[PDB]
Design a protein around this ligand. Structure first.
Ligand code: NAG
Ligand code: NAG
Lengths: 97, 49, 265, 312, 97, 52, 265
């Protein structure tokens, strides 16, 4: 979709095979010299960059601390947790002592 | 021109339709679902042997 | 029985060093512990009807593998009999042929281990009237004409022993450097050295001559079986023969060099 | 693939700008520019070649040399006579092959000029260049003290490990001086000591080759013949001003110099605010000298995201 | 961010030619007759306006993209990992589950 | 390019004399779009200019 | 100013070939187009308290990188001041110390490009009574004793110019082979050949001697700057010097060889 996020798409960064459509129209030669006038819509990447909105870091409820390399949250607090703890008998001490 | 139609999910079942436009002869349209390809998203958990 | 690749007269000079270049990078032996044991065939169409006018691979068969279609449509349209892999009839079948389907077909064979590949070219055409639908043979290619949507067949059979299944135990590719003694006719040489694909080398005769008969330690790998004879002596005078045989690939070749010791001038 | 540079020669181009403020041809044609570096380093691509010796010269590498082409021939020159300006003088960061890196304040267009001792040639291209900085405050210049963060910049080292640019042999070329038509009958006078081809279509597509020779053609009109100084020796880049050869086959590649790389960068530490007292609330006396980004959000179910820009 | 491709146009002098597509992503092609070719070297070829030229273009990711890439992710089945430290009998043990 | 005043100066080898006057100079273009610089390709219209 | 790595007397024989082995695999230049521009430091504890008695890496700082904790607990417990990366004070802080935490600590520095690494060893102990909680220095290591759960600090500072940030432009590692003319004292040589990290070589003097002064074409890469002089002549008589300097790594060394031409005996 021209003029939108993700206008250019690829399976991998260095993929030879690509698919894209951004409404390129050729213009007829119109001057003395050899020239190829091309008309195209503005790139969508910079478009989404200009008005991408605020990042999730300023919107996550409970102040989740988000890290990218696992794409995971940490140090975020909400909810209850039931747990069962097993303790060795030897750790216990008789009331006699 | 754009035409809308519903087709069963099945291979080797051609479906025939027509498009009505004033002053244009109705155009035969044959649609065939050659095959299906259901591809899900999966993640590798671990291996055993 | 090997075939004489070429016969060359070597004017080896006494005392100097002579080189017999018997070698072939085709004969190169795979270095990795897993020598390739598989071969591939495929079909590819180059239809100029496409504005992109590229070559697209319809399908490919892998030895001991599973049939896999590159696209989602050729399944059903393309039929590659699995049993034919043993027969070698790597033919192709089209159920229905469209005006955009006609073009140029090519059946290709590739083998990494033997490093041998082949290609055969065919032409396909489609017409609305069956009157002109008739095959013909152009010597360098074959032209097929058939009605649109009619089932058509394209033959690709090589009838070769290498390309048909043979689970023969991988005999080491024998290499023999054998020198005819002085004043002796060809085919009467005694093996100077023997080389195996495993890398083991069997030396014959004196050890000093073998050391001076320099051969690259990676000859079995690189295939550089060229013989470098140093400090030439009158004893070394005589014809040399470099024999190579590969049982798995079935190759058999021999190179003969008329090595005569000539005094410095 | 390779990285050699002596296998190609500079080519002409058509700059929309010239010293006369009108579009015209020049060897300083520029087509592409990049400004993604955090520091603001600018990559400029030009048709001509510098940072190496003139194409086809005995030596290949010479920083001071400045290769360009005109009057049907290529030649060297001094690079020191080259200047760049967007809103004023610009400093040179480096040059390599077709490309260069510079750094200078923003503006609306980028111009590169060279003085030939007696004549000056300038070519420029419009481009939106605006100074930008990393962090939550858009300051004027990086400070002496502050936090350290990651950033991306174009290295000032010739060695590069990014990009890939095609390289192929050139197409045909045209001239008039090869053909003279003072008299009714045709006359062709190719430059001395140079093989030349010529073509004419009257009656048939008849062509002739002259090795320092003047070969006549039957048809008379001046328009009716063209000549080529075909050399097909030095490769050229795919540019709109150039003309594709019939082969249209790729022949090699080259690396774009001064690749982007991550690196540590400094950022300011703003005057920390003063926390005040307010029942069920807080009043902050925020103090700053330059635009800064403030934000906050409730830690409960409701995000209550708030963001703002503060100038003073 | 992408970059448009502006390859050298094809010129057929005083004759004919036809457009051909290309596998390159977002490719475009178009012919034009009655061209007016000129260059510093002059009229590239000669015929009384009979000549024509084919032009085409496509797009490719710029080198900067190598590090300016943005990846679109589809996510599901959030899983939570908790690190617990337990003290018993003035003895400290740990687990992460 | 435009500005707010125009200055003309001459250096006498050892001394410099400069004189300037204020003036509202703003870049303007013809057509329905106020662009930055005339393009290579586009329509052709009438305009008025001082001959060189 | 370089430092004399070693001085050796070379009894070069006239006519024969002499070899000066000036070289260092440490000086090897990275082959890939992306020469490493990053350095790493890390902390690792070898606490024999663990029955597994292995060494586990607490954390590691990457130049121009982000702090990353190997486990899920050391965050908060382990504090590595980011600014300290410029200061070089690669110290470690523990908030609370347990009986299972005491053991052996090691601060390690690694740099791929310069191929220089260092390690420093420390000892940590924990006691229930603060009376015995006192550090001491053993010369080869330092022992820390502190109360359980008390905040403790372990210092690791090298105070080295290489390990502190310096974004200096990568000057080509200069290599100079300069020969003192016959009957000339040392330090008066004229550069016979110059080698740059980029691979360009500047030749001086006759071309034939340079060709016979065989140097491996990959010397700038492999670092094998050893000079092989062939067909020795009386002109070649004199001391040879092999100077190397790396501005980025800051290395500066020189090797002097007393090369005197000796007639065959
Ligand atoms: C040479 C050869 O094998 N030809 C056969 C062909 O006659 C048959 O129609 C096809 C169907 O499987 O298989 C193949
Ligand atoms: C032109 O090229 C031909 C073909 O090799 C050559 O024989 C002739 O000498 C050349 N003439 C020149 C370069 O003037």
């Amino acid at each position: 979709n021209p003029g939108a996020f993700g206008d250019i798409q690829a399976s991998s960064l260095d993929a030879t095979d690509i698919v894209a459509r951004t409404d390129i129209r050729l213009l007829k030669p119109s001057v003395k010299n050899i020239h190829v006038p091309y008309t195209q819509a503005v790139s969508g990447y910079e478009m989404w960059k200009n008005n991408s909105g605020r990042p999730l870091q300023e919107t996550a409820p409970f102040g989740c601390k988000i890290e990218v390399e696992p794409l995971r949250a940490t140090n975020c607090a909400y909810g209850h947790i039931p747990i069962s703890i097993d303790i060795p008998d030897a750790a216990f001490v008789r009331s006699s002592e | 021109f754009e035409h809308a139609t519903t087709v069963p999910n099945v291979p080797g079942i051609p479906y025939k339709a027509l498009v009505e436009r004033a002053g244009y002869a109705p155009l035969n349209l044959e649609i065939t679902v050659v095959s299906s390809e259901l591809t899900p998203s999966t993640n590798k958990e671990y291996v055993t042997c | 029985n090997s075939v004489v690749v070429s016969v060359l007269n070597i004017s080896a000079t006494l005392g100097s060093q002579a080189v017999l270049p018997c070698k072939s990078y085709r004969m190169v032996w795979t270095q990795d512990r897993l020598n390739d044991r598989q071969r591939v065939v495929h079909w590819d169409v180059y239809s100029t009807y496409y504005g992109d006018n590229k070559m697209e691979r319809l399908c490919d068969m892998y030895s001991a593998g599973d049939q896999r279609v590159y696209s989602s449509y050729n399944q059903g349209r393309i039929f590659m009999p699995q049993n034919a892999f043993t027969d070698g009839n790597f033919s192709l079948v089209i159920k229905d042929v469209a005006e955009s389907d006609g073009g140029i077909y090519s059946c290709n064979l590739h083998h990494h281990y033997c490093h041998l590949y082949e290609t055969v070219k065919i032409q396909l055409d489609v017409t609305k009237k069956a009157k002109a639908a008739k095959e013909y043979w152009d010597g360098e290619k074959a032209v097929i004409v058939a009605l649109e949507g009619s089932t058509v067949m394209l033959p690709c059979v090589n009838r070769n022993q290498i390309w048909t299944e043979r689970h023969s135990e991988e005999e080491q590719q024998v290499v023999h450097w054998d020198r005819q003694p002085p004043g002796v006719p060809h085919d009467r040489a005694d093996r100077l050295i023997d080389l195996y694909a495993s890398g083991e080398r069997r030396s014959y005769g004196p050890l000093f001559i073998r050391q001076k008969m320099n051969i690259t330690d990676t000859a079995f790998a690189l295939g550089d079986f060229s013989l470098r004879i140093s400090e030439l002596e009158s004893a070394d005078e005589g014809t040399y023969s470099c024999h190579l045989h590969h049982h798995y690939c079935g190759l058999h070749e021999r190179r003969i060099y008329q090595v005569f010791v000539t005094e410095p001038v | 693939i390779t990285d050699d540079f002596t296998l190609t020669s500079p080519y002409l181009g058509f700059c929309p700008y010239c010293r006369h403020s009108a579009p015209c041809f020049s060897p300083i044609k520029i087509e592409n520019v990049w400004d993604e570096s955090d520091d603001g380093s600018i990559r400029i691509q030009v048709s001509a070649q510098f940072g190496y010796n003139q194409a086809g010269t005995a030596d290949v590498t010479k920083f001071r040399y400045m290769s360009y082409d005109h009057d049907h021939d290529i030649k060297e020159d001094s690079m020191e006579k080259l200047a760049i300006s967007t809103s004023g003088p610009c400093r040179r960061l480096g040059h390599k092959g077709y490309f260069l890196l510079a750094q200078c304040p923003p503006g609306d267009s980028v111009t590169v000029s060279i003085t030939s001792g007696a004549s000056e040639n300038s070519c420029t291209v419009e481009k939106k260049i605006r100074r930008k900085f990393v962090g939550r405050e858009e300051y004027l210049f990086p400070p002496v003290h502050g936090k350290l963060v990651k950033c991306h910049v174009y290295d000032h080292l010739k060695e590069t490990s990014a990009g890939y640019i095609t390289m192929h042999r050139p197409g045909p070329h045209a001239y008039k001086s090869y053909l003279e038509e003072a008299s009714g009958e045709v006359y062709i006078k190719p430059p001395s000591g140079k093989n030349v081809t010529y073509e004419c279509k009257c009656g048939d597509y008849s062509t002739g080759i002259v090795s320092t020779r003047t070969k006549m053609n039957g048809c008379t009109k001046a328009k009716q013949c063209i000549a080529y100084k075909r050399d097909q020796t030095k490769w050229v880049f795919n540019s709109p001003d150039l003309i594709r050869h019939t082969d249209h086959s790729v022949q090699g590649k080259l690396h774009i110099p001064f690749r982007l790389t991550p690196t540590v960068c400094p950022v300011p530490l703003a005057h920390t605010p003063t926390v005040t007292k307010w029942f069920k609330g807080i009043t902050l006396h925020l103090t700053a000298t330059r635009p800064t980004l403030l934000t906050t959000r409730k830690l409960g179910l409701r995000a209550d995201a708030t963001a703002e820009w503060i100038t003073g | 961010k992408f970059h448009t491709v502006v390859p050298s146009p094809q010129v057929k002098c005083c004759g004919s030619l036809e457009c051909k597509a290309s596998s390159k992503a977002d490719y475009t092609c178009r012919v034009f007759g009655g061209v007016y070719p000129f260059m510093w070297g002059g009229a590239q070829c000669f015929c009384d306006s009979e000549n024509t030229q084919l032009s085409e273009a496509y797009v490719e990711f710029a080198p900067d993209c190598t590090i300016d890439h943005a990846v679109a992710l589809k996510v599901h089945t959030a899983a939570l990992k908790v690190g617990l430290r337990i003290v018993y009998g003035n003895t400290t043990a740990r687990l992460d589950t």
